Structure formats: structure tokens, C-alpha cells
């Protein structure tokens, strides 16, 4: 298992990264420092996570300490939905760059296909509770992302939470200048995503799997929800390989040619989650894990279901 995958912009992306959604601002600086110290070279970020300044403190300290060189890091962030407007994309990217202490991003993603009314609120609401859309169509947002490549702010651009038809809309854009490099989507044994992964891979788009552990810290978790880390069938595969359940859950997407971004702020787990390059799941293990699909989402985007570009009405 090579550590990096080749993107359609000609750059290499580490297949294992550290997630940062929900990482508390008072813990994420140490988490990222530990991650870099134990071998991580890819950090997944977003403005909407409200912790990029603190992530950036860690990156900058490790660059200053010469633990790593900038060219060895692969830093990803995402354009939030209230910035889909032509005239707001550059400033949103620059705010992320200034918070992360960087002069470029390796990859910048459209976080969701849904644009919202700009303003201070990340989910602007009408008086009845629906998100207020923007009329900017996503093809125009894509053109604004392409500009960022041409201005040197980002090395690669991509998408996140785009369904099959929305990916196709990007690929069929009149005058398309840069194809998406990545589609970052939820993916794990309970949401295996065969249809969408095959489509993206067939077009040369690399897929990143988010919430690979089933996001046990998601704010809306309920006791009755399925739990990947506690599933005895997955624990049994882990025991057979002398690995933890989390290690199996991370290795699984790697063997599907996916990038994977488990989140932790616990130093021991950050280290555990990196120790996934020294064992192999059999084809039978892989097919068995795929069989657990039930189309279950951590991230259903429930605050934007009324938006015309909501991605999860479609089968895939
Ligand atoms: N593009 C999008 O819309 C989107 C959506 C969701 C996620 N993401 C990205 O994907 C990342 C990962 O997804 P996620 O944060 O939803 O969840 P996840 O990575 O599936 O799970 C994170 C949870 O698992 C725990 N954990 C981590 N390693 C563990 C281990 N070895 N043993 C036991 N528990 C362990 C963490 O606890 P501790 O931290 O307390 O150790 C945390 O509660 C995010 O942080 C974000 O970067 C992107």
C-alpha cells in the first residue's frame, strides 16, 4: 500500500489524513502537532469547523521546527455554503489561508452543492426555519474555484457531498477548465457508496471517505443508532488480524483506492489510526464489510433539505 494517490492535477495526495470537524479549539493544536509528529502529512479542515486558526498554529509550529517541509504537507479546506457567490469565493479562500498560516492550499473543496444567502449566519433561516438559498448556480461557483487555481491560492479544486448527477453537471460544464480532483463523501460499511464511487473513479476523480468510523461524536447521535466501532462482526475481523476495529475501518477504504480522514483529538488514537500500512484485508474481508451497507448517513444535511440542490434525494 503506497502512501499517496495520484490526482488528475498531477499532484500526489496522502491516502490517510487527520479530520478536524468537532475537534475542540483548545485541543486541536496539540492533536495536529501529535499527528505530524507520528507521521500524518494530510489535514482535512473547513471554515465552518471554526477551528482553522488553531489548526494553523500547529502547522506553522511544525514548519518552523522543521519537522516537515511545506511541500510534504497536503492541507485541505472547504468553501462554505454562504460563499458560493463569484465575488465572495476568493475572500473565503483567503480567510482560510490566513487562519491556516498558509500561502496555498493543496486542495479546496466546495463543501456542499447548496449555496445559501451570504451573511454572518452559516445557515441563514427564514421565519419558518428553512435555509435561505442563493441563486448562484454551482457551475458559476465552479468557475470561481477555477480562478483560485489560476491565481495560485490552491493547487487543486474539488467537491464534497455531490451526488452522481451533480458531479456529471460539473464534468459537462460548458468551457470546463479544470475537472474536480476529488469528491469527498461519507463512506463506511453502513454507507458503502458503490454506485457513486465507481462513477467518480471511472472519471478519474479521487474519492475521500469521511466519517469512516461512523462519527461517534456527531452532535445528533442517538443510543439506538448503529455503531461501527461496536459491531461484533467488524470486531471479529479486527481480532483475526490482531488490529483494532478502528484500524480495520480505516484500512477498508484504503483498499478501495479511497483517501480516508479519521478524526481524533486523543493522542493515543491519533497514533493508533496511523498504524494501518502493515496489514491487508482479504478480498473476502472486503466483500464481507461491503455487505454491511444499509444506506445509513451520519451527515444527512438536515438543515438544507428544502434547497433545490440538496444532494440526497437522488439514489446516488
Ligand atoms: N465534507 C463533509 O461534509 C464532512 C462531513 C463529515 C466529516 N468530514 C471530515 O471527515 C472527518 C472524519 O469524520 P467525523 O469527524 O465525522 O468522524 P469519524 O472520524 O468517523 O469519528 C470520529 C470519532 O471517533 C473517535 N475515534 C477516533 N479514533 C478512534 C479510535 N481509534 N478508537 C475509538 N474511537 C476513535 C473520535 O474520538 P476522539 O476525537 O475523542 O478521540 C471521534 O469521536 C471530519 O473530522 C472532517 O474532517 C467532512
* Secondary structure (DSSP) of 32-57: HHHHHHHT--EEE--GGGT-HHHHHH
Is residue 138 within 8 A of residue 170, CB to CB? The reply is yes
As for ligand 1, residues whose beta carbon falls within 6 Å of it are 19-22, 44, 111, 160-161, 184, 210-217, 229, 244, 246, 261-266, 269, 272-273, 298-299
Residue 205, C-beta contacts closer than 8 angstroms, at least 6 positions apart: 8, 158, 167, 179, 180, 181, 182, 183
CA atoms within 13 A on the CB side of 96: 28
Closest CA to 219 of 149, 118, 121, 302: 302
Closest CA to 112 of 130, 87, 133: 133
**Ligand 1 centroid from CA 216, angstroms:** 7
Active site amino acids: 49
Experimentally determined by: X-ray
**Closest approach atom of ligand 1 to CA 217:** 43
Write out the three cell numbers for 110.
466546495
Is residue 203 within 8 A of residue 171, CB to CB? The reply is yes
**Nominal resolution (angstroms):** 0.9
Task: Give the sign of the dihedral formed by CA 168, CA 46, CA 91, CA 98.
Answer: negative
- Provide the residue count of the chain: 316
Helix/strand/coil percentages in the chain, nearest 5: 35, 15, 50
**Closest approach atom of ligand 1 to CA 262:** 19
The C-alpha cell 483475526 sits at 240
With the most atoms of ligand 1 within 8 angstroms of its CB, the residue from 185, 211, 248, 251 to mutate is 211
Classify residue 26 by burial, with Cβ atoms within 10 Å: 0-12, 13-18, 19+. exposed
Cα dihedral value 209, 213, 216, 218, nearest 10:
0
Cα radius of gyration rounded to whole Å, the chain: 19
Alpha helices in the chain (DSSP H): 25-38, 52-64, 89-100, 138-150, 164-171, 194-202, 232-241, 245-254, 267-274, 283-290
DSSP label at 76? E
**Ligand 1 centroid from CA 86, angstroms:** 32
Q: Which residue has its alpha carbon closest to ligand 1 atom 8?
A: 210
Amino acid at each position: 500500500m503506497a502512501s499517496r494517490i495520484l490526482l488528475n492535477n498531477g499532484a500526489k495526495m496522502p491516502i490517510l489524513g487527520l479530520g478536524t470537524w468537532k475537534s475542540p479549539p483548545g485541543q486541536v493544536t496539540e492533536a495536529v502537532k501529535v499527528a505530524i509528529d507520528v507521521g500524518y502529512r494530510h489535514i482535512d479542515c473547513a471554515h465552518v469547523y471554526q477551528n482553522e486558526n488553531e489548526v494553523g498554529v500547529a502547522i506553522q509550529e511544525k514548519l518552523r521546527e522543521q519537522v516537515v517541509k511545506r511541500e510534504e504537507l497536503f492541507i485541505v479546506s472547504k468553501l462554505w455554503c454562504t460563499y458560493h457567490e463569484k465575488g465572495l469565493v476568493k475572500g473565503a479562500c483567503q480567510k482560510t489561508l490566513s487562519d491556516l498560516k498558509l500561502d496555498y492550499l493543496d486542495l479546496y473543496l466546495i463543501h456542499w452543492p447548496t449555496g445559501f444567502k451570504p451573511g454572518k449566519e452559516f445557515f441563514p433561516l427564514d421565519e419558518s426555519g428553512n435555509v435561505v438559498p442563493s441563486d448562484t448556480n454551482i457551475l458559476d461557483t465552479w468557475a470561481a474555484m477555477e480562478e483560485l487555481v489560476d491565481e495560485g491560492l490552491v493547487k487543486a479544486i474539488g467537491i464534497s457531498n455531490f451526488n452522481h448527477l451533480q458531479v456529471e453537471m460539473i464534468l459537462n460544464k460548458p468551457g470546463l477548465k479544470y475537472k474536480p480532483a476529488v469528491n469527498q463523501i461519507e463512506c463506511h460499511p453502513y454507507l458503502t457508496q458503490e454506485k457513486l464511487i465507481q462513477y467518480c473513479q471511472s472519471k478519474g476523480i479521487v474519492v475521500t471517505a469521511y466519517s469512516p468510523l461512523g462519527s461517534p461524536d456527531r452532535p445528533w447521535a442517538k443510543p439506538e443508532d448503529p455503531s461501527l466501532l461496536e459491531d461484533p462482526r467488524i470486531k471479529a475481523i479486527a481480532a483475526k488480524h490482531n488490529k483494532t476495529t478502528a484500524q480495520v475501518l480505516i484500512r477498508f477504504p484504503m483498499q478501495r483506492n479511497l483517501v480516508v480522514i479519521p478524526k481524533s483529538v486523543t493522542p493515543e488514537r491519533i497514533a493508533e489510526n496511523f498504524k494501518v500500512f502493515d496489514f491487508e484485508l482479504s478480498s473476502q474481508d472486503m466483500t464481507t464489510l461491503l455487505s454491511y451497507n444499509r444506506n445509513w448517513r451520519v451527515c444527512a444535511g438536515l438543515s438544507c433539505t428544502s434547497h433545490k440542490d440538496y444532494p440526497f434525494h437522488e439514489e446516488f
